[PDB]
Symmetry: none
Subunit: 33 residues, 10 copies
């Protein structure tokens, strides 16, 4: 699988407490909280 | 599978506490909270 | 899998305490909180 | 897997205390909090 | 796996105390907090 | 008004983010969120 | 107003981010978040 | 107003980031977050 | 106003970053975050 | 206002960075973060 030619803007103005995962972009893999 | 030519704008103004996953874009893979 | 030609802007204005993972971009691999 | 031709801007304006991982870009590998 | 032709700008304006890992870019390897 | 001879046990196992007030006991006064 | 002879036990096991007030006991006064 | 003969136990096991006030006991006064 | 005969135990096991006030006991006065 | 006959035990096991005020006991006055 191929990924290209992408424009991404991510904003996290305020987060209290994150026990998991915050991801802008994820082509593949495994993420576990 | 191929993904391309995408414009993405993501906003997270306020989150108390996230125990899972916040993802802007996910082509594939496995995410577990 | 190949990834290229990507523009990414990431903002984290305020985070209290993160016990997990904050990732701008992840092509592959495994991330565990 | 090959990754190239990427522009990435990362901002962390304020973080209280991070017990996990903050990553701008991760092509592969394993990250554990 | 090969990685090249990347522009990365990283900002950490203020961090209270980090018990884990802050990484601008990670092609591979294993990072444990 | 008089208050006395009180046994109070308070537990807050997990709170995401509180924008108001958490009070174990309040004899009087004014609290505004 | 008089307050006396009180036993109070307070527990805050985990709080993400508090923008207000956490008070074990408040006889009087004014608290504003 | 008089306050006396009080036993207070306070626990704050984990707090991400507090922008307000954490008070064990407050007889009077004004607290603003 | 008079305050006396008080036993207070305060615990702060872990705090990421506090922008406000952490007070064990406050008879009076004004506290602003 | 008079304050007397008080036993206070304060513990701060770990604090990342405090931009405000940490007070064991405050009879009066004004504290600004």
């Amino acid at each position: 699988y191929e990924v290209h030619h992408q424009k991404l803007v991510f904003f996290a103005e305020d987060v209290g407490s994150n026990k998991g995962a915050i991801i802008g972009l994820m082509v593949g893999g495994v993420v576990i909280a």
